[model samples]
Target: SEEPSTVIMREAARHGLTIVRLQPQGSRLSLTVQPADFQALMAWLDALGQAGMTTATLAVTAVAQQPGWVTVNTLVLERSDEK
Candidate 1:
């Protein structure tokens, strides 16, 4: 089973991030700070820092879809501790 790329992208954006690219084989989805779309994720992170969530972590999970639904089973994390 495979996940639809569109659903993946939308889910990522809803979480305050964006998928930079979706691989042809659907093995992975690359996410980066979306500079366009005015959804600048990095800016949101910066705002979070200002709001006292200075030490923060980001995690992403990818779901495998059969036909109608996707089930996320993998987790990836990114973190920062500012001093």
Candidate 2:
């Protein structure tokens, strides 16, 4: 979800991490997370979900790179107020 991405980005910024790039594609958002920041991002997302603010899903896509990185794209949806 974007919330997680938002949180990660915020934390990354706080820590003076380099943000290669961040782009939102429709419901899916992508971040070119540096290797140094990857694990922390995953941990933060896990913690956020455990705290009940966000959820995550993963998909496999083709990319050209050595030791291909796991690209995590999150689709954040808003809940309806109406029952």
Candidate 3:
């Protein structure tokens, strides 16, 4: 637990290796992951779950990069509970 949280989070984005915002994301968090990388990421999380690290089913969706092109994707994990 010595590493910074941003370091781990950086692994979730493309410009990882070096997270300088220096970095960024939006309300729902941009899926700046490389295509196959998504599956790998999921698998990594799955492994963590199997190891009893932690597990949670977060609903997500695909983004249809259309401009301002709009990525007509979806997100189903919006929650506003102060939980």
Candidate 4:
């Protein structure tokens, strides 16, 4: 299986979302995305699931410092029952 970070970064590059922070070892993830590009976030999440990671709660909070972008809260991934 691939690392979650590797999987997410690949999806980010394909979807045009910016990975503001990623702590794979800690099972944390953060991304900077525009509201218009939310579909990209969904696709990104799908990619994670396909890679064998189950996402936890997802919070999309507006960036106070940068209004043009929103910051997605942390994500926690556990091994899938199958693999």
- Strongest candidate by TM-score: 4
| Best candidate according to lDDT | 4
Model 3 regions more than 4 Å off: 1-37, 66-83
lDDT of 4 at 20: 60
| Every model: Cα RMSD to truth | 14.8, 6.5, 9.1, 4.2
Residue 27 accuracy (lDDT) in model 1:
30
Q: Write the per-residue lDDT of candidate 1 for residues 1-83, one digit (tens) a residue.
A: 13334443544566555456544223333334332323334344444334333212334332333332222222222223321
lDDT of 2 at 1: 41
Each model's C-alpha lDDT? Answer: 0.37, 0.43, 0.30, 0.63
lDDT string for model 4 (1-83, tens) is 55557777788789886766666545444443344255667777788778776666566766667574556665454445444
Off by over 4 Å in 4: 26-36, 61-83
lDDT of 3 by residue, 1-83 (tens): 22223332443353222112211121122222232234545554344233332322233345455212122122111111221
Ranked by lDDT, the better of candidates 1 and 3 is 1
Global fold similarity of model 3 (TM-score): 0.31
Instruction: Give, for candidate 1, the lowest lDDT window spanning 10 residues.
Output: 69-78
Assess every candidate by TM-score: 0.29, 0.38, 0.31, 0.62
When sorted by TM-score, best at the front, the candidate numbers are 4, 2, 3, 1
| lDDT (tens digit, per residue) of candidate 2 on 1-83 | 43444644665566443446655443334544444334545554454344343333433243346344444343232222221
